[PDB]
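Sequence of sh3 domain-binding glutamic acid-rich-like protein 2 (Homo sapiens).
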Amino acid sequence: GSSGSSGMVIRVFIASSSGFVAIKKKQQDVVRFLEANKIEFEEVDITMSEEQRQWMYKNVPPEKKPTQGNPLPPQIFNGDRYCGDYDSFFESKESNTVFSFLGLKSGPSSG
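Predicted 3D structure, token representation.
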């Protein structure tokens, strides 16, 4: 059923230049966890690459939009699937589902 397999990457969008330091921390706790969990991911500097950000703004509903207005980081994104902002992650950490929250639990791969 279609061979091939590159791998996964929890593309974590970060805006080095956002304003709300709080957001920064969130971005950390995110990557941090992954790092501490030896989880694969990448810090998509949305700040540096406008597109990256713009994209996110296109992959984020209003019902998910944090605080108020345009969507702010962090904005974890597994491939092209909207994982969830820090809110999601955190809401998962409590259940220790961060892995599943990102989609790190569905078929053989890990090990």
